[PDB]
């Protein structure tokens, strides 16, 4: 996951302004057990979080914050 | 004119608490960035000193900004256009000016509105969003507790 | 051979693809200071992918539990 | 805009939804997908019944309004044969 989330480069519109970046991606524990996957009609799943941030270079500002990317089986 | 430890106010963030002064390097140039955050959303905020008036950061205002956001809310003769597409792209492009005087006249003609019929849903986001933003920016200027900074603009919309 | 690993990564990868044109799509038609990385980013193709191929997919198969030996092969 | 959006509404889905209703559906969808990546959950629809200001029982039938047909002629899997509409009476 972190491969594919290196894939991803820092991007830049038309005029090469921003860039986001994903540096590091991290598990929680699940939030429903095997058993309670198993008999209440559930997807044994943890969340995946990645630590995304977004450098403006016209302006010098980076807005470093955590998104949550979905429950990954 | 910026230091450690003081509370200055971001654009569609509100108030916001600065950590430390960070000396990046940046193509051989010692840029003087400083870092500052909010409760919010959990993010950071790096910018340089070189450019933070450009970006727009203001400090805290003092006893010259209550008054007149308060007598710029109970200013009467407040009209909009019948069409409700002008009124609708004016009060963001307001929003996004970031003066305090200017979201305070947004957010008490958008409140009357409100009162007096009754707008949307989708409306609701936004006038909740400014208010949010608006109790943010009064919360650190006064130094006062957030509920008690929610609390006590109860009394003065009305 | 691809494994699990690479099939969930291609899956992955292309529901991320997806992402980035969406947020290229959404940074066309945004005004900058106004960008926040909650915002301009969608998690929901790279669920959407993720739950596509876990389901109705000729790799992802109803695993049989007839005896041990069928679950192993 | 205004026409490419009614026309969406009139001539995209295969059971007509009129463009009041096609405009609820949407912004009930893009208000659940806004408190789904805001929460990080799938939002209940209780919740959502009071930030849209309308009924529970109103929002349970925009979800059960909201939907697309399949086709018949969908094959089950390796046997090309056998469809979709042979199996219902």
Request: a negative charge.
């Amino acid at each position: 996951l972190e491969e594919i989330f290196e894939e991803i480069s820092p991007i830049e519109d038309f005029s090469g302004s921003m860039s986001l970046t994903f540096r590091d991606h991290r598990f929680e524990p699940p939030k429903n057990s095997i058993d309670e996957c198993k008999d209440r009609d559930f997807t044994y799943a943890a969340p995946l979080f990645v630590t995304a941030e977004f450098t403006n270079n016209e302006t010098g500002e980076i807005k470093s914050q955590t998104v949550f990317m979905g429950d990954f089986p | 004119t910026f230091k450690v430890g003081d509370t200055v106010v971001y654009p569609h963030h509100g108030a916001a608490l600065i950590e430390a002064i960070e000396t990046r390097q940046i193509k051989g140039v010692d840029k003087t960035y400083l870092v500052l955050k909010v409760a919010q959303g959990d993010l950071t905020v790096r910018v340089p000193a070189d450019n933070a008036e450009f970006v727009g950061v203001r400090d805290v205002v003092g006893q010259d900004g209550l008054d007149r956001v308060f007598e710029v809310l109970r200013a009467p003769y407040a009209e909009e256009p019948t069409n409700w597409s002008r009124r609708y792209k004016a009060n963001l492009e307001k929003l996004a000016s970031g003066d305090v005087i200017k979201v305070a006249e947004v957010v008490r003609d958008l409140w009357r509105r409100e009162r007096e019929r009754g707008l949307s849903a989708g409306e609701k986001r936004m006038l909740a969003k400014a208010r949010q933003i608006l109790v943010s920016e009064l919360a650190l200027a006064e130094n006062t507790n957030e509920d008690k900074a929610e609390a006590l603009l109860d009394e003065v919309l009305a | 051979i691809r494994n699990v690993g690479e099939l969930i990564q291609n899956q992955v990868r292309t529901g991320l693809a997806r992402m980035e044109r969406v947020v290229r799509e959404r940074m066309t038609t945004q005004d900058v200071e106004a960008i926040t990385p909650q915002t301009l980013i969608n998690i929901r193709p790279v669920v959407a992918s993720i739950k596509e191929f876990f389901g109705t997919s000729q790799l992802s198969q109803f695993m049989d539990q007839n005896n041990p030996l069928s679950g192993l092969t | 805009r205004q026409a490419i959006t009614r026309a969406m509404a009139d001539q995209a889905r295969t059971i007509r939804i009129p463009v009041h209703m096609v405009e609820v559906i949407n912004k009930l969808a893009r208000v659940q997908r806004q408190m789904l990546q805001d929460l990080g959950r799938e939002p209940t629809p209780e919740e959502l019944a009071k930030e849209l200001d309308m009924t529970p029982e109103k929002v349970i039938e925009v979800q059960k309004y909201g939907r697309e047909p399949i086709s018949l002629h969908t094959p089950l899997g390796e046997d090309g044969d056998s469809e979709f509409g042979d199996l219902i009476e």
